[PDB]
């Protein structure tokens, strides 16, 4: 119907609660391995944020895996920053991490993050 | 860190993508039964929106059930409207459904929906 009312804060409240489930390890269903580091998460949140995870978890064989190993070139801190962004909308972008964050966002197919990294890099050159 | 940047549309985009997964029946992990009707959903989204589902899916026995049966007094249309609200932030509140929506929101422990129903009812009296 076109006569709905909308609760402005609903989407951010849902995301805040999903991050609280992640913090408490409630209903996490996959472990992402990035060389020596492991990250627990919810497949649905990963798919809703990343083109790469959407492709992985819609694959008829990979959708059933409980562990996904990322390319060894991926930086664990870069992945950690992007995982936090997925769950909070907040990106901890710093001079010391921007190259790793951009490379990880390109691999994960997160276009809006790639765009802001490119802009911040261009401003410093 | 307190130096993060934030992507304003991220939370609403995540919710839009979770509703697209629900529409395509991708990674739905529970069926909610409301008398003769069945509704497929994601446990994490239900828990992030409803105090009742949070209690159910954090219970050590109920967290493993693939089917949850609601109280026979719950109206399926009222539940359908609230499930759509969980996934879109949009509430299809009408004169013909407000009593069923309010009763369902009270049962599901969705306080913001209960509050707006009470306000709309008070304005019409």
């Amino acid at each position: 119907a076109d006569s709905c009312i909308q609760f402005t804060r609903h989407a951010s409240d849902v995301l805040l609660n999903l991050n609280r489930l992640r913090s408490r390890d409630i209903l996490t269903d996959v472990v992402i391995v990035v060389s020596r580091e492991q990250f627990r998460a919810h497949k649905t949140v990963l798919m809703a944020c990343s083109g790469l995870f959407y492709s992985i978890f819609t694959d008829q064989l990979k959708c059933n895996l409980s562990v996904i190993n990322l390319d060894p070139e991926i930086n664990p801190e870069g992945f950690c920053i992007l995982l936090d962004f997925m769950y909070t909308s907040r990106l901890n972008l710093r001079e010391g991490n921007i190259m790793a964050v951009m490379a990880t966002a390109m691999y994960l197919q997160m276009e809006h993050v790639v765009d802001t990294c490119r802009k911040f890099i261009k401003a410093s050159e | 860190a307190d130096s993060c940047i934030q992507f304003t549309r991220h939370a609403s985009d995540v919710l839009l993508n979770l509703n697209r997964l629900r529409s395509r029946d991708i990674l739905t992990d529970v069926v909610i039964v409301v008398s003769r009707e069945q509704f497929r959903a994601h446990k994490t989204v239900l828990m992030a929106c409803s105090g009742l589902f949070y209690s159910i899916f954090t219970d050590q026995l109920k967290c493993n059930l693939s089917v949850i049966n609601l109280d026979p007094e719950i109206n399926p249309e009222g539940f359908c409207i609230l499930l759509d609200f969980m996934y879109t932030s949009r509430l299809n509140l009408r004169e013909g459904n407000i009593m069923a929506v309010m009763a369902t929101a009270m049962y599901l422990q969705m306080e913001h929906v209960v509050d707006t129903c009470r306000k709309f009812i008070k304005a019409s009296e």
């Binding site: 909308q6 609760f7 | 913001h112 707006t116």
Partner: peptide
């Protein structure tokens, strides 16, 4: 909160 979207 609530608004007309």
């Amino acid at each position: 909160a609530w608004v007309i979207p």
